Structure 1
Amino acid sequence: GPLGSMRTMVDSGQLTDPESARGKLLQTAAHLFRNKGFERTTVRDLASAVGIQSGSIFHHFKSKDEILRAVMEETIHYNTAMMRASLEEASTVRERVLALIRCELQSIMGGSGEAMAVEWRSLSAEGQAHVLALRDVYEQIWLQVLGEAKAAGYIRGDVFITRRFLTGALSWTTTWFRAQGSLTLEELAEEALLMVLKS
């Protein structure tokens, strides 16, 4: 089950327990990097906010750049794994597309927010390398599922162009969704499905 696939991520050391020592650092660092800037935040600022000695951070990260990398990778890994979980809950081709639309909207409207909005211009290149690899996996899932829909005859246009259109359509929702007031995210997801798929 999808819960089990998430658990496997936990028992791979890929996802971090929020109430664990490492989780405390990541959670706080994300807050600090977000609403105070990465360049302004120091390692000792992180330790102070958490409530530990500045020397005990070396146990977990051994560098500030690696804290930023861990904050970004954790958030992407979680999001991607949650898309996979939602896909396992889907039963048809339409529900699989809807699963991806709904997941992306949830992140767009808040997820993780702090650890998602965060400083690419201050992350290293080797750190940029693995993050880009994670982004490729994320987009791979979109392309595969959209590819399934096209094979089933729900998409007449190009799969890659379709994803690019849908990327823009969904991200632009930050500018108008709250103003609707009564529209739920689930209703929003169904509308996006109506747009991009047939029948």
Structure 2
Amino acid sequence: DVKGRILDAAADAFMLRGFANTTIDDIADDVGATKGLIYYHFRSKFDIFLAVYEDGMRRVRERVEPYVGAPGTGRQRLVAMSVAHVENLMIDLGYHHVVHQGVRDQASTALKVRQRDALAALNELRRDYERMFHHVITEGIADGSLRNVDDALATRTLLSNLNAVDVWYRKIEGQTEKEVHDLASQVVDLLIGGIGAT
């Protein structure tokens, strides 16, 4: 509900000014409320970080998991999973940064165990997500619709390639859903299809 509004503006502020130099007041300014309502909804600043991670990891999974069991060859579901994964990134950049800057928070010596208890639990959520891609890649290797490559290395490589889109992608003012979807499909075409000729 109205936490969703806080999670977005928190993720975006987390992405722009950094977790370290963003404060609960800064989210209060962005969300247009007082320091009260934020602290009503999450325990602490690190709780919003955890919540954006958790929510953003749920967003990408509800969008990608439906294709794991769908019909089609392995390559065909992998393509659909990837376009979804890239499209999630370009639409929800703030969530994507907090998810993959959960190490930027790890850069400071891991302080609270009862927090590194939830952050590690969250890491397992990202682990499970990547397992979906490993499963389809394995299936696509066996059904011939992918190359006989190393299943582990191809999974690491592909997922890092999908998350690397944020290196050069910017939110263009006025890009439509269709345009973003099409650009994600262009990107996935180079990732799955390669750039060399055959």
**TM-score over 0.5 for the pair:** yes
Q: Is the 8 A contact 2:73 2:140 kept in 1?
A: no
How do 1:178-197 and structure 2 match up within 5 A? 184-195=183-194
Structure 1 residues 90-99 or 23-32, which shifts more?
A: 90-99
Superposed, which structure 2 residues align to 1:151-170 within 5 Å?
Answer: 151-153=142-144, 154-170=146-162
Q: What is the TM-score of this pair, normalised by structure 1?
A: 0.72
Alignment of 1:82-121 (within 5 A): 82-87=63-68, 91-108=72-89, 110-118=90-98, 119-120=101-102, 121=104
Match of 1:142 in 2: 133
In structure 2, the CA distance between the partners of 1:46 and 1:95, relative to structure 1 (3 Å rule), is same
**1:47 is aligned to 2:28:** yes
Aligned residue identity for 1:130:
A
Q: Secondary structure at the match of 1:91?
A: coil
CA-to-partner distance for each residue in 1:134-159, whole Å, 9 max, x for gaps?
Answer: 11111110011111112213331221
Tell me which amino acid in the other structure corresponds to 1:93: G
Q: Deviations over 1:127-186 (max 9, x none)?
A: 3212211111111100111111122133312211222333455455566789xxxx8432
Going from structure 1 to structure 2, the CA distance change for 1:177 and 1:43 (only over 3 Å counts) comes to closer
C-alpha distance in structure 1 between counterparts of 2:56 and 2:124, whole Å: 14
Partner Cα separation in structure 2 for residue 164 and residue 49 of structure 1:
36
Residues 22 and 96 of structure 1, relative CA distance in 2, 3 Å threshold: same
Aligned partners of 2:78 and 2:167: how far apart in 1?
23
Question: Equivalent residue of 2:157, what SS?
Answer: helix
The sequence identity of aligned pairs, in percent, is 25
Paired position in structure 1 for 2:116: 125
CA contact (8 A) 1:90 1:99 kept: no
Which of 44, 53, 56 is residue 75 of structure 1 equivalent to? 56
CA distance in 1 between counterparts of 2:25 and 2:161 reads 41
Q: 1:151 to 1:79 in 2, by over 3 A?
A: same
Relative to structure 1, the CA distance from residue 85 to residue 57 in structure 2 (aligned partners, 3 Å threshold; closer, same or farther) is same
Superposed displacement of residue 89, structure 1: 5.8
Residues 26 and 70, structure 1, Cα contact 8 Å, conserved in 2: yes
Q: Name the CA shift for 1:172/1:70 in 2 (closer, same or farther; >3 Å).
A: closer
Matched with 1:4 is none
How many residues are treated as equivalent by the alignment?
Answer: 174
Gaps of 5+ in 1: 1-19
TM-score by length of 2: 0.72
Provide the C-alpha distance between the structure 2 equivalents of 1:122 and 1:174, rounded to a whole number of angstroms.
Answer: 19
Q: What letter corresponds to residue 140 of structure 2 in structure 1? A: A
Where structure 2 has 5 or more consecutive residues not aligned to the other structure, the ranges are 107-114, 171-181
